[PDB]
């Protein structure tokens, strides 16, 4: 049988346009919505990625997880001339999806994509991907690895005083160790986004965790 994520892939391929990334954006978010698997991912989450990229322009992006690549062409398809996406899935299957997702929205060349375990390829991105410090980090889909990652990024000094951490689907009371660091930190500036759409109940939830570095002002 067909997975979802190769379902949604071939949804794309048989009814986007080949090197359209709003085609593809919406293609996804028509059939993801009528499956009723995700309701409006474009107006709930795609809109508040877009204003973070927008305000910071990131030169460098990590992306820590993916599914079916949604997320990974909503950021390359902003990305200025110059920048660049690496993004980390350990499920093989995850990442092949995302890479023939980028392939087909005609984004490939802006992106990386790293199958793997993030402990084992994070202590690896200074030198084998020539990183310094990442401007901008996307967590996604892993509500449990945010923390871990966290950590491990500030331990192997990938984040640089306003780095900007923004993680995806953080709803309380859900990521409760995540947010209870990032909040209580002196050293993470943070900001929570809601989007509602037309209900009275929360669709997707984002958190926006500006790293300040170790010091004072
Ligand atoms: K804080």
Known sequence: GDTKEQRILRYVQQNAKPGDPQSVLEAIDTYCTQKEWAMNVGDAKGQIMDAVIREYSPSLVLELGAYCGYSAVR??????????????????????????????????????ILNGASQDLIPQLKKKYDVDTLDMV?????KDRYLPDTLLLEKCGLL????????????????????????????????HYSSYLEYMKVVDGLEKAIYQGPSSP
């Not at 001339?81 to 899935?89: D, K, N, Q, S, Y």
């Not at 996307?138 to 892993?142: A, K």
């Open 138 to 142: 996307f967590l996604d889909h892993w």
């Open 160 to 191: 640089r005083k306003g780095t900007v951490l923004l993680a995806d689907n953080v709803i309380v009371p859900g990521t409760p160790d995540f947010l209870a660091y990032v909040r209580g930190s002196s050293s993470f500036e943070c900001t």
């Open 75 to 112: 950021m390359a398809r902003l990305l200025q001339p110059g920048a660049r996406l690496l993004t980390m899935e350990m499920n093989p299957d995850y990442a092949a999806i995302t890479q023939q997702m980028l392939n087909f929205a005609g984004l490939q060349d802006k992106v990386t």
